Enzyme design. Structure first.
Site, mmCIF file in Angstrom:
data_model
loop_
_atom_site.group_PDB
_atom_site.id
_atom_site.type_symbol
_atom_site.label_atom_id
_atom_site.label_comp_id
_atom_site.label_asym_id
_atom_site.label_seq_id
_atom_site.Cartn_x
_atom_site.Cartn_y
_atom_site.Cartn_z
ATOM 1 N N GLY A 9 -43.082 38.275 -75.484
ATOM 2 C CA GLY A 9 -42.235 37.102 -75.540
ATOM 3 C C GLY A 9 -42.778 36.059 -76.460
ATOM 4 N N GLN A 10 -42.311 35.057 -76.911
ATOM 5 C CA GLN A 10 -42.677 33.948 -77.670
ATOM 6 C C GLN A 10 -43.767 33.252 -77.141
ATOM 7 O OE1 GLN A 10 -43.147 32.403 -81.054
ATOM 8 N NE2 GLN A 10 -40.954 32.987 -81.282
ATOM 9 N N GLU A 244 -63.603 40.685 -58.404
ATOM 10 C CA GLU A 244 -63.934 39.478 -57.335
ATOM 11 C C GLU A 244 -62.718 38.644 -57.159
ATOM 12 O OE1 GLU A 244 -66.787 39.406 -55.738
ATOM 13 O OE2 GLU A 244 -68.149 40.796 -56.869
HETATM 14 N N1 LIG Z 1 -84.192 33.999 -53.886
HETATM 15 C C1 LIG Z 1 -83.195 34.596 -54.633
HETATM 16 N N2 LIG Z 1 -81.896 34.832 -54.428
HETATM 17 C C2 LIG Z 1 -81.080 35.384 -54.983
HETATM 18 C C3 LIG Z 1 -81.162 35.772 -56.330
HETATM 19 N N3 LIG Z 1 -80.236 36.274 -56.728
HETATM 20 C C4 LIG Z 1 -79.198 36.050 -55.872
HETATM 21 N N4 LIG Z 1 -79.445 35.524 -54.908
HETATM 22 C C5 LIG Z 1 -78.969 35.406 -53.564
HETATM 23 O O1 LIG Z 1 -78.638 36.548 -52.729
HETATM 24 C C6 LIG Z 1 -76.994 36.359 -52.713
HETATM 25 C C7 LIG Z 1 -76.635 37.767 -52.506
HETATM 26 O O2 LIG Z 1 -77.492 38.752 -53.166
HETATM 27 P P1 LIG Z 1 -77.021 39.542 -54.622
HETATM 28 O O3 LIG Z 1 -76.938 38.469 -55.714
HETATM 29 O O4 LIG Z 1 -77.820 40.846 -54.932
HETATM 30 C C8 LIG Z 1 -75.346 40.286 -54.518
HETATM 31 P P2 LIG Z 1 -75.130 42.045 -54.784
HETATM 32 O O5 LIG Z 1 -76.154 42.455 -56.041
HETATM 33 O O6 LIG Z 1 -76.040 42.909 -53.390
HETATM 34 O O7 LIG Z 1 -73.585 42.767 -54.876
HETATM 35 P P3 LIG Z 1 -72.773 42.669 -56.087
HETATM 36 O O8 LIG Z 1 -73.613 42.007 -57.411
HETATM 37 O O9 LIG Z 1 -71.434 42.388 -56.024
HETATM 38 O O10 LIG Z 1 -72.646 44.477 -56.798
HETATM 39 C C9 LIG Z 1 -76.697 35.805 -53.597
HETATM 40 O O11 LIG Z 1 -75.673 35.396 -53.125
HETATM 41 C C10 LIG Z 1 -77.914 34.621 -53.699
HETATM 42 O O12 LIG Z 1 -77.903 33.630 -52.432
HETATM 43 C C11 LIG Z 1 -82.284 35.579 -56.702
HETATM 44 O O13 LIG Z 1 -82.826 35.981 -57.933
HETATM 45 N N5 LIG Z 1 -83.345 34.796 -56.097
HETATM 46 N N1 LIG Z 2 -47.521 26.617 -73.228
HETATM 47 C C1 LIG Z 2 -46.577 27.075 -74.118
HETATM 48 N N2 LIG Z 2 -45.290 27.594 -73.676
HETATM 49 C C2 LIG Z 2 -44.621 28.042 -74.636
HETATM 50 C C3 LIG Z 2 -44.968 28.446 -75.844
HETATM 51 N N3 LIG Z 2 -44.239 29.115 -76.669
HETATM 52 C C4 LIG Z 2 -43.031 29.247 -75.856
HETATM 53 N N4 LIG Z 2 -43.540 28.749 -74.495
HETATM 54 C C5 LIG Z 2 -42.410 28.491 -73.583
HETATM 55 O O1 LIG Z 2 -41.824 29.911 -73.247
HETATM 56 C C6 LIG Z 2 -40.755 29.661 -72.858
HETATM 57 C C7 LIG Z 2 -39.751 30.775 -73.197
HETATM 58 O O2 LIG Z 2 -40.680 32.026 -73.508
HETATM 59 P P1 LIG Z 2 -39.970 33.184 -74.236
HETATM 60 O O3 LIG Z 2 -39.511 34.345 -73.005
HETATM 61 O O4 LIG Z 2 -41.058 34.002 -75.048
HETATM 62 O O5 LIG Z 2 -38.589 32.892 -75.054
HETATM 63 P P2 LIG Z 2 -38.219 33.847 -76.453
HETATM 64 O O6 LIG Z 2 -39.220 35.004 -76.850
HETATM 65 O O7 LIG Z 2 -37.902 33.005 -77.655
HETATM 66 O O8 LIG Z 2 -36.866 34.430 -75.811
HETATM 67 P P3 LIG Z 2 -35.782 34.594 -76.542
HETATM 68 O O9 LIG Z 2 -34.886 33.225 -77.018
HETATM 69 O O10 LIG Z 2 -34.771 35.609 -76.334
HETATM 70 O O11 LIG Z 2 -35.972 34.919 -78.107
HETATM 71 C C8 LIG Z 2 -40.002 28.611 -73.305
HETATM 72 O O12 LIG Z 2 -39.274 27.662 -72.350
HETATM 73 C C9 LIG Z 2 -41.397 27.574 -73.464
HETATM 74 O O13 LIG Z 2 -41.421 26.302 -72.870
HETATM 75 C C10 LIG Z 2 -46.439 28.216 -76.408
HETATM 76 O O14 LIG Z 2 -46.894 28.265 -77.331
HETATM 77 N N5 LIG Z 2 -47.350 27.534 -75.204
#
Ligand SMILES: Nc1nc2c(ncn2[C@@H]2O[C@H](COP(=O)(O)CP(=O)(O)OP(=O)(O)O)[C@@H](O)[C@H]2O)c(=O)[nH]1
Ligand SMILES: Nc1nc2c(ncn2[C@@H]2O[C@H](COP(=O)(O)OP(=O)(O)OP(=O)(O)O)[C@@H](O)[C@H]2O)c(=O)[nH]1
Ligand SMILES: Nc1nc2c(ncn2[C@@H]2O[C@H](COP(=O)(O)CP(=O)(O)OP(=O)(O)O)[C@@H](O)[C@H]2O)c(=O)[nH]1
Ligand SMILES: Nc1nc2c(ncn2[C@@H]2O[C@H](COP(=O)(O)OP(=O)(O)OP(=O)(O)O)[C@@H](O)[C@H]2O)c(=O)[nH]1
EC number: 3.6.5.-
Lengths: 427, 426, 426, 427
Positions: A9-10, A244
């Site tokens: 879309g736009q 996450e």
């Molecule tokens: N004393 C320290 N604590 C740490 C350090 N890094 C992380 N943490 C603490 O341990 C908490 C969890 O441990 P991890 O960072 O190892 C999370 P983990 O790697 O086991 O899982 P994923 O990263 O999602 O694969 C984390 O929220 C911190 O509170 C560190 O370098 N030193």
């Molecule tokens: N925040 C933001 N909103 C936008 C922008 N451009 C369009 N919009 C919003 O998008 C809405 C419609 O989006 P689209 O579905 O892409 O409209 P279109 O592609 O022109 O659809 P047609 O009329 O069929 O051509 C509008 O009501 C706008 O408020 C932008 O650049 N920034």
């Protein structure tokens, strides 16, 4: 650690005009398309001294896809990625889904498969669209059905743009928003929302931009999406990948609608007259004056809050900052998730756009929040739809496409079933 | 000769493990390149207990560095001491755990642990006689909590006699860096109490508290916390690494610190912990170290020891010192403070002293303590668990990896049983 | 003095043969021009076992390079070592085999093998006492598979007592570089089991697996694979080329590795196979080589040895080393891993050690193994054979050269009988 | 290692205009005819500093044989090789076979014998023609009968050009295609097919040539024939001669109809914005959008697939590429040929034509495939013939040449007997 993007879309392609402007700027990638492991998440190397995005731009109207083909970013984008249609969906959810949708999905869905096999570390997806027109609403729900059944296990980051509560660009978009949410509920793994008058109000108050255009809006929107994926692109004290967000913010498989916000939103002249630390920017992101949607958080409760920081930020002061958030009673978490906090730190700070509006800061926060405050936006959006639907206003266009009375009722009760969950978890 | 195979799992376990090799390599005078340049020949005596001899007078640690995120190995490899490790030991997947206990234990790490177990067999069979497995992991997240307990199950299965040593870094609600802390913690300790024989409950809240009060640091990074946890690891193994007037093996610590097999959750400490300003205004005598050791605020866990009682404590000293002043201080800390020591055990203290202090410091000490007050760490984690489990929030992400709700029930029962037994002997 | 006449057939056999002369010529210190410049006089002791003395202190190998495509000889002739070979040995046709077993065995090679047999007689009668014929060929394609087995039949006919040594490079379905693989393989092994006494079953899938895991090469060319296969050829003949504490002839390997005459299909190995990064982080001691030798993944065949059992294995070591540590490692690898060794043979290991290591390396080893697990290579080839033979696809191209369908039936029966007998002693 | 070529009809000689343009370019042979062992396959040395092709151009109409005699390639071609007729076959299979065919075969078949004795390493033949006009259909079937009985044991590579499914240059060519296939079935050892709208569609989509002429088509057609014979002309890691195609792709002596395709078909500007490796070009060659004939492979099955690569291509990554083809279920091989793969590698890459349309690439694939997908083209080609044959449309021209009702019935039942084999092997 890759993630391929699509832009419908736009609104979607206009986000891609500025969102990829700051991605290529952050990695030193000029518009020509050349100047180690940081840019591999969103840029593939092409032979020798050249880069190409893992980007796809689709818009059934040819109005702005060719604008990129004749703009300044001609060399960066591979011209076959810039897919374009032949005629416009024209603010009809059905036209972008059945008549004009079904003639081009055979090209783009198989092309999205081409980038999948070209990649190896595909984490998930991140789509860009809006619920306003038929392109962003109809084509995405069609494509999401065929992308979900193709892969399923992979994640999808939905950065939608709501219609504002009273501000609005069209009249028929309540039909678009309620119909696309009927299909987006069971397919999207994460549904990030944006509002039109809120981002107008944020830059007016905090950034002091009294007359913004859409290109000013998309600078900080890309900064929000750049912030969540910066942990994948750079190293930090506690990195967080895309997986996450599904495990931390989605307590139940239906309520998967976070809320995005960003701080410090400060101009160039106010940066010198204001000190930036983690405490004030943390409190700044929770207040209603800086939320990206027109919903006050005090009316509801925060179910979860993922705090993604950038720049030089030590890990001991953030623990002091979140303590002040927990004891402050103007905002209160749900009893079922007392430790509703996740911290993410990245050493590389945000980058300023040349000629933009935002100012360079040594630290920044991009806080994501799953809460019940969005139920007010659903109700007023569903309420305004009922007046047009009761009088059969603008129904003759959708049913002329092929629809009937049935799916409007399914879209209504699905929204009530969605709000049935928000009032349930609001206890 | 009582060899030790080292395991590192999770980002925190790799960080404290990475800094741990930095400290002891300087104790032995080992270059980052691995060549030995120590002054005293006693450093090269028991160098085999953590290293393997290689050509050109080079050494390599028996460090099996495990993770599911490849970025953690790049930081360790690019660090000041990444070049000393064997490149083959770096077994790592592609996708991170995403802070899910069931991923690392059933889907992500279950395919990778089979490859890691072959490396454990490689380093074990090369040994003369291994004593125990020194593992480092955090109960926060999915990698250290989920895959780590899976790896402990296989090693405990194949080696049902060796000393399964673990350093479980478990956070508190005061520092809640992840919403999925109780499920990662409650499920991990369900496997540790049944298998392991040592569990050093370290808390980040207590670790930050050391930096402000007694260390007086303005900006305590994680690396500053890793330096403190590495001091405890080097302290407990100092007996079996150098000559000493009383050499207590890890088995000889486990026999005294474990009055019943489940009561093996400890609380470490270290001294002297002085600031830069308070260096010259402090005496290096032995009674000054002892009052800092048994200080209630100088514990590396959130639970204060005054809220309960010590079943049995140990004090591994380092450097030259008279045994008589050590015995008096071990005597005096149970006479006047008898309320903090259970009297159905007559003597709750274990002593040990090495003839080689840490590098740069003249004297040092290292504390181990199995307190009844430690149960509040398990109590508060159970409160967070039951708070989220009463409405079953975030449990559906564990059902995708085949984990059932009854496994959460069995973990909570074994968790709550652990709280009741420390309340018995309080 | 136990001379060896070398045969090379097919493109793969010429490539591994071409690189094979490159390696051993550097072991003996032989220039590409053929002049001897070695440092130690022991290299010139048994130089006759692969070379012939010529005027001007020049040497020439007894290499009979056979093919049906002239382009293969041009690559060998233009190579780094093409100038050392005799120009008369290059017997080659004009038209390639076209990947047809029957062409090289009946029409294309049958006219050429008569000319090749006169050169075999020329090199044999010039010998003092030849021990065996070291042949190199691949079972893929028509040249090595069809003409090679024909040439083996004539040499086995004229020399029914010498040691018919072959290195049959046989691929797997994981790397299917030719659609006519099973017909070339099934028909070739029909002749090999009846005539030959050694069959080193090497697979390209296993050879690529070495380059990624333990060698850690980004872009393994065929020349990198030829360097590995050449290491095995130089290892088995190291006893009869240099002095050694235990010199085992190829007959003395064949007597131990062949408990029954048909069970002579082996599985080679080589160590140390270290990457560029893992050079300094590895000890050159003997137990480190032994664990790499018996490593299930470090076999040069697709069949894992854990799926079956070793009837009898051999370990030809190189370089100075204590015999006691070799005997303990040969002892220990059958005590704990007794499930992978049949116990109706009391001792399944053969040892040997030379006093000259490879050039550049301090120590080395070479493995031979006749496993019951090797039958799955013949099982999967039979599955591919019966898959294509059930509808008789591509058989009409074999009928043009007079080959009948019953010869395919007789090959399949002898193939399937070979699978059953390894299943007996498993 | 030589192979002499003949070119029949307007399509055959028009292929020779561009096909020999790239042969002489690949060996540094200027149009003058001069600048070691690589060019001997298709160029004989004439005394000192001069070369002559082993080429024969025959066309009964004199329209375009003299165009080469007055074109730019005057010195390269020996003028006696450029054989020409006196009058045209005029889209009649019978006229090019009996009346005008039988007056010139006595010259060219004995002249083809002259090049045979001049050569020593004659591997086989490669003829160029089309089933459209009477020249490419009638004269080839006449010459193939007399060339087969003369040699027999040697191979023949038939590069025919079908009439397209709905596109077509004439009306009577279904009579030509069904009659020439009645004789070509028992004579040709390998029958490579080409379609008209497919090659128009390939360069439009991939190469971005919206307005191609026939000279743009023949550039890549010669590249396809140059690719299969590059293994004979240059050395590689695993070379394949002409004899491999008969043994690998012909499981039964009647089904000898492969399908040719080529990749990467990429323009000059898209080469910079797209990385070329063996994986994506391998998957690109199997999809229906790049096949040289209008037949979808998913409807049928691949019996065999010979993958001939060029340029710097290592031998370990191709094994990874074909593994992805085997596990991908959108294309599936027959159970009777599970290892339906042959690899061929050549170090010398493709050469770009000066002033052409294709772009220079460091690697390229020319994949040949024997499959049952061509049976659909036979059926629709046989089906459209039945409407004209039922009403005796355009029969008075052929029987006026001398034919009768009989051989049309033999050509019909022969096609059904051919399709009887394809439905049999499709099980
Ligand atoms: N004393 C320290 N604590 C740490 C350090 N890094 C992380 N943490 C603490 O341990 C908490 C969890 O441990 P991890 O960072 O190892 C999370 P983990 O790697 O086991 O899982 P994923 O990263 O999602 O694969 C984390 O929220 C911190 O509170 C560190 O370098 N030193
Ligand atoms: N925040 C933001 N909103 C936008 C922008 N451009 C369009 N919009 C919003 O998008 C809405 C419609 O989006 P689209 O579905 O892409 O409209 P279109 O592609 O022109 O659809 P047609 O009329 O069929 O051509 C509008 O009501 C706008 O408020 C932008 O650049 N920034
Ligand atoms: N380890 C190596 N394997 C090779 C090499 N060359 C080929 N091969 C493998 O051996 C297989 C068949 O062996 P060859 O290349 O010799 C086929 P051959 O020459 O015997 O018949 P024709 O070439 O058709 O006359 C082949 O498919 C490869 O998998 C090489 O240089 N090294
Ligand atoms: N792809 C391709 N097809 C061609 C080309 N030239 C001719 N054709 C096709 O060839 C078909 C007829 O070929 P011919 O038998 O040579 O026709 P002809 O020689 O003019 O026959 P006459 O009318 O008797 O002169 C036509 O229908 C064309 O579609 C070419 O350059 N490229």
């Amino acid at each position: 650690r890759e993630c391929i993007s699509i832009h419908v879309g736009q609104a979607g392609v206009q986000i891609g005009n500025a969102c990829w402007e700051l991605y290529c700027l952050e990695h030193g990638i000029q518009p020509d398309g050349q100047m180690d492991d940081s840019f591999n998440t969103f840029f593939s190397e092409t032979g020798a001294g050249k880069h190409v995005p893992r980007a796809v731009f689709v818009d059934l109207e040819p109005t702005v896809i060719d604008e990129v083909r004749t703009g300044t970013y001609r060399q960066l984008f591979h011209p076959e990625q810039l897919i374009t249609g032949k005629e416009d969906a024209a603010n009809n959810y059905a036209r972008g889904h059945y008549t004009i949708g079904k003639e081009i999905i055979d090209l783009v869905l198989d092309r999205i498969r081409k980038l999948a096999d070209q990649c190896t570390g595909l984490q998930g997806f991140l789509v860009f669209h809006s619920f306003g027109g038929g392109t962003g609403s109809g084509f995405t729900s069609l494509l999401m059905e065929r992308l979900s059944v193709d892969y399923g296990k992979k994640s999808k980051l939905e950065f939608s743009i709501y219609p504002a509560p009273q501000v609005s660009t069209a009249v028929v978009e309540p039909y678009n928003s309620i119909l696309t949410t009927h299909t987006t509920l069971e397919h999207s793994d994460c549904a990030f929302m944006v509002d039109n008058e809120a981002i107008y109000d944020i830059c007016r108050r905090n950034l002091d931009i009294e007359r913004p255009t859409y290109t000013n809006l998309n600078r900080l929107i890309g900064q929000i999406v750049s912030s969540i994926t910066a942990s994948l692109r750079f190293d930090g004290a506690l990195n967080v990948d895309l997986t996450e967000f599904q495990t931390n913010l989605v307590p139940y498989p239906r309520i998967h609608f976070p809320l995005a916000t960003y701080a410090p939103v400060i101009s160039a002249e106010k940066a010198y007259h204001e000190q930036l630390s983690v405490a004030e920017i943390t409190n700044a992101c929770f207040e209603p004056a800086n939320q990206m949607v027109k919903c006050d958080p005090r009316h509801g409760k925060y179910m979860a809050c993922c705090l993604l920081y950038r720049g030089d930020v030590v890990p001991k002061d953030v623990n002091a900052a979140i303590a002040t958030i927990k004891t402050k009673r103007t905002i209160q978490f749900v009893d079922w998730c007392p430790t509703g906090f996740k911290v993410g730190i990245n050493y590389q700070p945000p980058t300023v756009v040349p000629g933009g509006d935002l100012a360079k800061v040594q630290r920044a926060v991009c806080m994501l929040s799953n809460t019940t405050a969005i139920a007010e936006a659903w109700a007023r959006l569903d309420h305004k739809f009922d007046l047009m639907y009761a009088k059969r206003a603008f129904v003759h266009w959708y049913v002329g496409e092929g629809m009937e009375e049935g799916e409007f009722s399914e879209a209504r009760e699905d929204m009530a079933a969605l709000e049935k969950d928000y009032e349930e978890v609001g206890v | 000769m009582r060899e030790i195979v080292h395991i590192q799992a999770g980002q925190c376990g790799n960080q404290i493990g990475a800094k741990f090799w930095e400290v002891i390599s300087d104790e032995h005078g080992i270059d980052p390149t691995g060549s030995y340049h120590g002054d005293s020949d006693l450093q090269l005596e028991r160098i085999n207990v953590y290293y393997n001899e290689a050509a050109g007078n080079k050494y390599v640690p028996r460090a099996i560095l495990v993770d599911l995120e490849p970025g953690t190995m790049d930081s360790v490899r690019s660090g000041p001491f990444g070049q000393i490790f064997r490149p083959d030991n770096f077994v790592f997947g592609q996708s991170g755990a995403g802070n899910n206990w069931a991923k690392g234990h059933y889907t992500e790490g279950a395919e990778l642990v089979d490859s890691v177990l072959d490396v454990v067999r490689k380093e074990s069979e090369s040994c003369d006689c291994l004593q125990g497995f020194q593992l480092t992991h955090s109960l926060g997240g999915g990698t250290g909590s989920g895959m780590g307990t899976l790896l402990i199950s296989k090693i405990r299965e194949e080696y049902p006699d060796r000393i399964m040593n673990t350093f479980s870094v478990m956070p508190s609600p005061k520092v809640s860096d992840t919403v999925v802390e109780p499920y990662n913690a409650t499920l991990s300790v369900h496997q540790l109490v049944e298998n392991t024989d040592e569990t050093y409950s370290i808390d980040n809240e207590a670790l930050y508290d050391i930096c402000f009060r007694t260390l007086k640091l303005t900006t305590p990074t994680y690396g500053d916390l890793n330096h403190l946890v590495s001091a405890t690891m080097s302290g407990v193994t100092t007996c079996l690494r150098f000559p000493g007037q009383l050499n207590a093996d890890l088995r000889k610590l486990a026999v005294n610190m474990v009055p019943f097999p489940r009561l093996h959750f400890f609380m470490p400490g270290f001294a002297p912990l002085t600031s830069r300003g308070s260096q010259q205004y402090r005496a290096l005598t032995v009674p000054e170290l002892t009052q800092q050791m048994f200080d209630s605020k100088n514990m590396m866990a959130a639970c204060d020891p005054r809220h309960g009682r010590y079943l049995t404590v140990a004090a591994i000293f380092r450097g030259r010192m008279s045994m008589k002043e050590v015995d008096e201080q071990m005597l005096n800390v149970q006479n006047k403070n008898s309320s903090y020591f259970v009297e159905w055990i007559p003597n709750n203290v274990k002593t040990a002293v090495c003839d080689i202090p840490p590098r740069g410091l003249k004297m040092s000490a290292t504390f181990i303590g199995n307190s009844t007050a430690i149960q509040e760490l398990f109590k508060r984690i159970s409160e967070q668990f039951t708070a989220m489990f009463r409405r079953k929030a975030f449990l559906h992400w564990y059902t995708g990896e085949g984990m059932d709700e009854m496994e959460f029930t069995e973990a909570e029962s074994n968790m709550n049983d652990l709280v009741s037994e420390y309340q018995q002997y309080q």
